[PDB]
Design a protein around this nucleic acid. Structure first.
Ligand SMILES: [Mg+2]
Ligand SMILES: [Mg+2]
Ligand SMILES: [Mg+2]
Ligand SMILES: [Mg+2]
Ligand SMILES: [Mg+2]
Ligand SMILES: [Mg+2]
Ligand SMILES: [Mg+2]
Ligand SMILES: [Mg+2]
Ligand SMILES: [Mg+2]
Ligand SMILES: [Mg+2]
Ligand SMILES: [Mg+2]
Ligand SMILES: [Mg+2]
Ligand SMILES: [Mg+2]
Ligand SMILES: [Mg+2]
Ligand SMILES: [Mg+2]
Ligand SMILES: [Mg+2]
Ligand SMILES: [Mg+2]
Ligand SMILES: [Mg+2]
Ligand SMILES: [Mg+2]
Ligand SMILES: [Mg+2]
Ligand SMILES: [Mg+2]
Ligand SMILES: [Mg+2]
Ligand SMILES: [Mg+2]
Ligand SMILES: [Mg+2]
Ligand SMILES: [Mg+2]
Ligand SMILES: [Mg+2]
Ligand SMILES: [Mg+2]
Ligand SMILES: [Mg+2]
Ligand SMILES: [Mg+2]
Ligand SMILES: [Mg+2]
Ligand SMILES: [Mg+2]
Ligand SMILES: [Mg+2]
Ligand SMILES: [Mg+2]
Ligand SMILES: [Mg+2]
Ligand SMILES: [Mg+2]
Ligand SMILES: [Mg+2]
Ligand SMILES: [Zn+2]
Lengths: 118, 155, 206, 127, 24, 98, 60, 80
RNA sequence: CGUUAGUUGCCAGCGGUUCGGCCGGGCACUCUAACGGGACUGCCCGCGAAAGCGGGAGGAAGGAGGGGACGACGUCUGGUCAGCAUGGCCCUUACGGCCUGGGCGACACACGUGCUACAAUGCCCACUACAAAGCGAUGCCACCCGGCAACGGGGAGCUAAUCGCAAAAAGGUGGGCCCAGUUCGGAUUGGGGUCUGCAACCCGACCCCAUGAAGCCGGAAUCGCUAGUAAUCGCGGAUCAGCCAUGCCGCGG
């Protein structure tokens, strides 16, 4: 069962299977199950190729998705980086952007601990 | 307890079996103050054990407990430098607490998915003489009689 | 660093507030402010008269301030001269059109704030502090006063090192809130610095 | 005709009205079990009637408000026992050894400044 | 858990309202 | 309908205040409903004991507003007669609503 | 604090947001209870003096 | 996630300055302490020295940067 | 437990019912808040010279019933002249004073204190049930309407035992997940938007879409609590336009 750009969720509930798609979360999954009139609880394996083709129809071109998404986000970064934007400097130096504190607990954004002497 | 004997708490009889040992076992199952959860766990496990085997779950609970009771353990005592593992008997009160605790901590090391499944199955195994609880008891009783050479340090 | 305030301790029983009225969320702030300005200006003008307590009551826009003084003569003045000047000065600050009452104090040596003030006065003129202290405890002790205690803080006699002085008499049981201990604080300012003066008096039981 | 007991446990009140009847119990306009039953300790509330074998003698109407349903249950135990004593005072000497007529004075200990929750102290290091 | 702000319990942990925790 | 809202920080001023009212209204009016007590509004304030920490030593004070209700039923004159201005208390405060 | 910093009294703040509490008795900047208009310290001193009507020693 | 919701805010100091500088042609470096303000499309092409607290930095304002605020290009801190 | 008191309480009791204490009405009960009573080793057995100890009845409660408030002579040259006061020494087109802007939020690292977790005694969804204590007059904001929502418009009531915050959460019934870095976990990041505020780049909170990191019970070591305690669950307030509150101070399950 391939829906988006090549994507094969299997053997699980369709609403949760769609999460395995890049541009789909729980919200967009429940929406595509909603407007396509498919019981969300069915196993992917039990899906009709008619229901499947309808799902591909809706999902493939309603929102920009896996490839175009990854690219558009990357180009969105290079956008604020190419300009002298501050946010761009934070993305350059691999630091938190949202206005967090860096004096401790920057571990997710930056280079898990690299210790020096004292 | 530096001043007094620190008298034992008197538990309330079980709402179902009118039995106190059951209430204590429920208490050891209960976590984060959820006694209703713990009780439903225990009793659903009583259905499991009473169906998969045609005997009264009461007698199996008592027997399973009874087979985990250790009669001897080991305690460190600081003697002339590094201390020693010193065997001695186990208070009946302490046999109680240890056997129930071991039963619960063993049941949760079981592969079974639901709680009452583990509880029932561990109760059955321990009542038949097998199961992890009876192995903690057999290992502790192996700690005594091994360091038996220090039976003069009784204290 | 122990021993919390005795008057603050006893506000419930065997002590009454120096301000007794009622107010809401919108009122209490500036009424308390007004009380503070009152006690301020009175402490300015009446220090020579020996004032101990100023009681501020309010029913509705009326002010029943009662001053407790050792020598009411200084308060009133000759034929009511000063009680005109400063009592009009009072209603100039607060537009309450506020009245005023004067009350004598029998045995100024029995009012803890007054005793503290007298001792601090002696300190600002540089008298021997242990004499001033034991003498004050006699003035208190020689009249009623089932207990009495006096504390003077550091820089005794202008000494380089701060010190703490002493000599209570009778029984001053701060720990029991039964028997109406009185407390008063005074401040002696001198060339060598600042000096705290604490006065405990013990009177009555139940 | 009718007998009454108040009962109280841990910030909760439950007025117990006993009358001779089938044995059916009403709470707050809900069946006894429609209020409880999902709660295992429920039956404990009725332990006063089993000590004197007063099961099928009395119907009861209860008014329970305050606290949580467990303390409510204990309040009901006490109320049933208080009415049960006013009915026949000779039940005192039967109900007393079980202590069903004793009030449980244990209440939530007050939160104290400096501590986290009234006993639990914030942890420290010394280094 | 109480950390997911788009679950009911994360909402009640922050004491806030949204799509995943309405009012009535 | 004659409502008398009694409010005060001192609970003895409120009682010494209300009792005189009832004794002035019972000589004239119907059976007054009663001095019905209303619950107490308690504002608490917690403050660190010293300046410049020693955070963990705070002491708190509480200011308690006490409330009382009167409700004279059918008074005409000899009630209001003794009620113009006869009260002693100071820290008490009274509102009237009709 | 400083006398100049009691310019809040003369606020005319030019923006409503620049108004701050400023305990009156001691000129405290930081911790100022709004119901008494005093700071925590001055509140403690005036409460122990007994110059705050209705304010008792909290105990329960 | 950035929000002014309506009436996109730009301080009046430089607004009446740049709009008048448009009528007379592109002008040289300008002085700005007000980075509070957003950027509007009629700033494109100018050169604005923004304050960081210490110095004035010259900023060439381009088409791609109309949505941001001044001082996004005039950072405050100096590290390494 | 009682006395006083009844616009919170009540088919306990009957009357009416748009079956909601709604009305009539009543204070009995629950409660609210003032005054009281009650526990004293007073009673019994035993030990003892005594004080007292053990046990027992009665009792709501016993040997300090439970929790507070309360911290002696002094110690540490303890903490703070940056809350206030203050001696002395300095500064006085300046150490003072106004403003705008930035900083107190910096990040290659280390420790402290906490939060949320690593899950099936769990997670999610629907439904439904039981608290105490507090705050509110331009504030609390029922309710209608728009909006997935934050929220906006409108607009009732409440100087508040009468109105509102308000939904308590765990729990209960029903259903989904099936041991997997997942329907665990919510970090990081893009994109869109509400609000307070003159103004959210440095530097706010909140909402919606998408992204879904580390983490699968923690080395040496180390902390808390002896009973409504630990553990766990939510609720409130202080300061404050707003908020970086997971803090603090309370509250009950
Ligand atoms: Mg008095
Ligand atoms: Mg001297
Ligand atoms: Mg006294
Ligand atoms: Mg006496
Ligand atoms: Mg009858
Ligand atoms: Mg708790
Ligand atoms: Mg409590
Ligand atoms: Mg989640
Ligand atoms: Mg602190
Ligand atoms: Mg100064
Ligand atoms: Mg401000
Ligand atoms: Mg009573
Ligand atoms: Mg009433
Ligand atoms: Mg009834
Ligand atoms: Mg003898
Ligand atoms: Mg005894
Ligand atoms: Mg006894
Ligand atoms: Mg006893
Ligand atoms: Mg005590
Ligand atoms: Mg006591
Ligand atoms: Mg004492
Ligand atoms: Mg030093
Ligand atoms: Mg010192
Ligand atoms: Mg800092
Ligand atoms: Mg709608
Ligand atoms: Mg009402
Ligand atoms: Mg009312
Ligand atoms: Mg009222
Ligand atoms: Mg289920
Ligand atoms: Mg996931
Ligand atoms: Mg990993
Ligand atoms: Mg796992
Ligand atoms: Mg202890
Ligand atoms: Mg706030
Ligand atoms: Mg932050
Ligand atoms: Mg909070
Ligand atoms: Zn102050």
């Amino acid at each position: 069962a391939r829906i988006a750009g090549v994507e094969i969720p299997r053997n699980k509930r369709v609403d949760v299977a769609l999460t395995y798609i890049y541009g789909i979360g729980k919200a967009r999954a429940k929406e595509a199950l909603e407007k396509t009139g498919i019981n969300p609880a069915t196993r992917v394996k039990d899906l009709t190729e008619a229901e499947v083709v309808r799902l591909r129809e809706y999902v493939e071109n309603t929102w920009k998705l896996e490839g175009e998404l990854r690219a558009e986000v990357a180009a969105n970064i290079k956008r604020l980086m190419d300009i002298g934007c501050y946010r761009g400097l934070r993305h350059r130096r691999g630091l938190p952007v949202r206005g967090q504190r860096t004096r401790t607990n920057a571990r997710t954004r930056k280079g898990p601990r690299k210790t020096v002497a004292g | 307890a530096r001043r007094r004997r620190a008298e034992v708490r008197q538990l309330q009889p079980d709402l179902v079996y009118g039995d106190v040992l059951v209430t204590a076992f429920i208490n050891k199952i209960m976590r984060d103050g959820k006694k209703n959860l713990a009780a439903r766990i225990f009793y659903d496990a009583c259905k499991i054990i009473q169906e998969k085997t045609g005997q009264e779950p009461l007698k199996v609970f008592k027997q399973a407990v009874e087979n985990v009771k250790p009669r001897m353990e080991v305690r460190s005592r600081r003697v002339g430098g590094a201390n020693y593992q010193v065997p001695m008997e186990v208070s009946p009160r302490r046999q109680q607490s240890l056997a129930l605790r071991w039963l619960v901590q063993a049941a949760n090391q079981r592969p079974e998915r639901r709680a009452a499944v583990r509880i029932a199955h561990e109760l059955m195994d321990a009542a038949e003489g097998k199961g992890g609880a009876v192995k903690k008891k057999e290992d502790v009783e192996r700690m005594a009689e091994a360091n038996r050479a220090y039976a003069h340090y009784r204290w | 660093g122990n021993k919390i305030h005795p008057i603050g301790f006893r506000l419930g029983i065997t002590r009454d507030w120096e301000s007794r009225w009622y107010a809401g969320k919108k009122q209490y702030r500036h009424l308390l402010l007004e009380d503070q300005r009152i006690r301020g200006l009175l402490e300015k003008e009446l220090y020579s008269a020996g004032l101990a307590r100023v009681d501020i009551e309010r029913a509705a826009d009326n002010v029943a301030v009662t001053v407790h003084v050792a020598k009411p003569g200084v308060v009133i003045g000759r034929g009511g001269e000063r009680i005109r000047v400063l009592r009009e000065e009072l209603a100039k600050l607060t537009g309450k059109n506020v009245a005023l009452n004067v009350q004598e104090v029998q045995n100024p040596n029995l009012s803890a704030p007054l005793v503290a003030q007298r001792v601090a006065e002696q300190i600002e003129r540089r008298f021997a502090v242990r004499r001033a202290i034991k003498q004050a405890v006699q003035r208190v002790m020689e009249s009623g006063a089932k207990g009495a205690k006096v504390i003077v803080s550091g820089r005794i006699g202008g000494a380089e090192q701060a010190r703490t002085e002493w000599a209570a008499q009778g029984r001053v049981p701060l720990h029991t809130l039964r028997a109406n201990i009185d407390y008063g604080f005074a401040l002696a300012r001198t060339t060598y610095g600042v000096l705290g003066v604490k006065a405990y008096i013990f009177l009555g039981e139940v | 005709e009718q007998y009454y007991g108040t009962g109280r446990r841990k910030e909760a009140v439950a007025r117990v009205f006993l009358r001779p009847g089938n044995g059916k119990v009403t709470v707050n306009g809900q069946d006894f079990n429609e209020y409880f039953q999902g709660l295992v300790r429920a039956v404990a509330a009725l332990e006063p009637l089993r000590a004197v074998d007063a099961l099928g003698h009395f119907d009861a109407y209860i008014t329970v408000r305050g606290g949580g349903k467990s303390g409510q249950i204990d309040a009901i135990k006490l109320g049933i026992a208080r009415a049960l004593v006013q009915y026949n005072p000779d039940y005192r000497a039967k109900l007393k050894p079980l202590g069903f007529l004793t009030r449980d004075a244990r209440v939530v200990e007050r939160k104290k400044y400096g501590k986290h929750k009234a006993r639990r102290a914030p942890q420290y290091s010394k280094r | 858990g109480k950390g997911d702000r788009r679950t009911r319990r994360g909402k009640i942990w922050r004491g806030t309202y949204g799509k995943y925790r309405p009012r009535k | 309908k004659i409502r008398i809202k009694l409010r005060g920080f001192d609970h003895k001023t409120l009682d010494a205040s209300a009792q005189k009212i009832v004794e002035a209204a019972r000589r004239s009016g119907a059976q007054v409903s009663g001095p019905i007590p209303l619950p107490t509004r308690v504002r608490r304030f917690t403050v660190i004991r010293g300046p410049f920490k020693h955070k963990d030593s705070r002491e708190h004070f509480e200011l308690r507003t006490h409330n009382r209700l009167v409700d004279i039923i059918n008074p005409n004159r000899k009630t209001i007669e003794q009620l113009m201005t006869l009260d002693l208390p100071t820290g008490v405060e009274i509102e009237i609503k009709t | 604090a400083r006398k100049a910093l009691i310019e809040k009294a003369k606020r005319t703040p030019k923006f409503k947001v620049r108004a701050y509490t400023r305990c009156v008795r001691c000129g405290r900047a930081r911790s100022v209870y709004r119901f008494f208009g005093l700071c925590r310290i001055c509140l403690r001193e005036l409460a122990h003096k007994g110059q705050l009507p209705g304010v008792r020693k909290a105990s329960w | 996630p950035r929000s002014l919701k309506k009436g996109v805010f730009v301080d009046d100091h430089l607004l009446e300055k740049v709009l008048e500088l448009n009528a007379k042609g592109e002008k040289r470096l300008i002085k700005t302490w007000s980075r509070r303000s957003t950027i509007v499309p009629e700033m494109v092409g100018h050169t604005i020295a923004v304050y960081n607290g210490k110095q004035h930095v010259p900023v060439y304002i381009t088409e791609n940067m109309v949505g941001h605020k001044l001082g996004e290009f005039a950072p405050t801190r100096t590290y390494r």
